[PDB]
Paper text:
Patients with cChHD possess high levels of antibodies against the carboxyl-terminal tail of the ribosomal P proteins of T. cruzi (called the R13 epitope). To study the structural basis of this cross-reactivity, we determined the crystal structure of the Fab region of the mAb 17.2 alone and in complex with R13.
The mAb 17.2 was shown by flow cytometry to specifically detect HEK cells transfected with the human β1-AR.
Residue numbers in the entry:
A (entry chain L): 1 to 218
B (entry chain H): 1 to 217
Write the structure that this text describes.
């Protein structure tokens, strides 16, 4: 099987700045008929892939001239002259020359934006949940950048590491920011024999972390 | 316009069987080679199977990992592409796309191969405890816990609240998914104007509405 190697794995580019991505094959994609079947596809978040380039350099209909495909044999390049917000997603090279028809591992194009501190919100377990025997404490860390953040959970001043589930949104379609959800799950009993619940957010925007807390009864 | 619509995706037990379908329209289906491409949760694209046109006697090709287990076929009279999958394995869990040549991709159909059983979620409102009064913006949410398989969709005020919504991807903890959604609105609307999340787990035919109500005593 032809091995398709895509680099970089991720890149972070300022809107209006150029981007160049590589795709290499373990063997020449020049087919028996003299044509080179190397496509470039873009997968936008939540969307199915869309082909941008085919036959190394041919642009698909309704694909801006900002995209340029180049190369031959085993070495291929996708270049974006100046990036736009809509370019964010994972780019794939797909070879159709030799069977099995292989794909590169993907290159995630991220939009570089200014730093932004998260806005933090804390939520106690709902009554619905307590009645069911579980207790989840939630923290939303909204509209921050960069993605890299640390969330610390504290029960009556003491740090809890187990029962913590974290999820990040994709870059905001208008903002390019991230949001994050941090769920601390503990038994209804454990929750009730404790009063102070705190989530601490350490982001590069401040040396001091963003703290949000609540007390069962106040 | 060219349309490719996949049908069939769902939860199957390991060693089980599932047939996927793809309805093609807006092009000469009978003159096109058709492919199936899959994408494992959070992974890259993986080519699965290819079928040539009638002119090329419907020759079929398969990736090594699915050869002898998967059967690609087509019904030109109905412009239907099919993928019969026998002896399913957990690593076959993926979103399956119908592709016209290497040109147009359908929406995809999710296939979950697991011993875990269909479990509807529990829908919990996220309301602030006694949080900051003169806070111009108020953040509310919905915690959607203990479901299987994916997906789950969250909508706020039946799709009216679009701006200010953050939908967090599901995280699988112990054969059960957990997802959350948040909504940020001015302090003028809620509490006065009600806030409700609409949760749908199609796999268990669950549609749950949770009104976000201020925390009582
Ligand atoms: Ca092989
Ligand atoms: Ca060939």
């Amino acid at each position: 099987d032809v091995v398709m190697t895509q680099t970089p794995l991720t890149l972070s580019v300022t809107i209006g700045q150029p981007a160049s991505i590589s795709c290499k094959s373990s063997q020449s994609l020049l087919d028996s008929d003299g044509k080179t079947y190397l496509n470039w596809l873009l997968q936008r978040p939540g969307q199915s892939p869309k082909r941008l380039i085919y036959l190394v350099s041919k642009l698909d209909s309704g694909v801006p001239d900002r995209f340029t495909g180049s190369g031959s044999g085993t070495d291929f390049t996708l270049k974006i002259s100046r990036v736009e917000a809509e370019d964010l997603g994972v780019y794939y090279c797909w070879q159709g020359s030799h069977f099995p028809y292989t794909f590169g591992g993907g290159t995630k194009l991220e939009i570089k934006r200014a730093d932004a501190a998260p806005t933090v919100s804390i939520f106690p377990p709902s009554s619905e949940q307590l009645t069911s025997g579980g207790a989840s404490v939630v923290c939303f860390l909204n509209n921050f950048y960069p993605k890299d953040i640390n969330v610390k959970w504290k029960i009556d001043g003491s740090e809890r590491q187990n029962g913590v589930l974290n999820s990040w949104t994709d870059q905001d379609s208008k903002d390019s920011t991230y949001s994050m959800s941090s769920t601390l799950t503990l038994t209804k009993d454990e929750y009730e024999r404790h009063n102070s619940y705190t989530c601490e957010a350490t982001h590069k925007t401040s040396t001091s972390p963003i703290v949000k807390s609540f007390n069962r009864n106040e | 316009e060219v349309q490719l619509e996949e049908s069939g995706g769902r939860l199957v037990q390991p060693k089980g069987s599932l047939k996927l379908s793809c309805a093609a329209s807006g092009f000469s289906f009978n003159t096109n080679a058709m492919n199936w491409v899959r994408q494992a949760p959070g992974k890259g694209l993986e080519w699965v199977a290819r079928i040539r046109s009638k002119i090329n006697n419907y020759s079929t090709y398969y990736a090594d990992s699915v050869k002898d287990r998967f059967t690609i076929s087509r019904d030109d009279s109905q412009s239907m592409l099919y993928l019969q999958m026998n002896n399913l394995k957990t690593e076959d869990t993926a979103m399956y796309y119908c592709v016209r040549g290497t040109t147009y991709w359908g929406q995809g159909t999710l296939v979950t191969v697991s011993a875990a059983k269909t479990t509807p979620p529990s829908v919990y409102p996220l309301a602030p405890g006694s949080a900051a009064q003169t806070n111009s913006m108020v953040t509310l949410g919905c915690l959607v816990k203990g479901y299987f398989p994916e997906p789950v969709t969250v909508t706020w005020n039946s799709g009216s609240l679009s701006s200010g919504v953050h939908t967090f991807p599901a995280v699988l903890q112990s054969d059960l998914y957990t997802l959350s959604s948040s909504v940020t609105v001015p302090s003028s609307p809620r509490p006065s104007e009600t806030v409700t999340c609409n949760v749908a787990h199609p796999a268990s035919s669950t549609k749950v509405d949770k009104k976000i109500v201020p925390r009582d005593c």
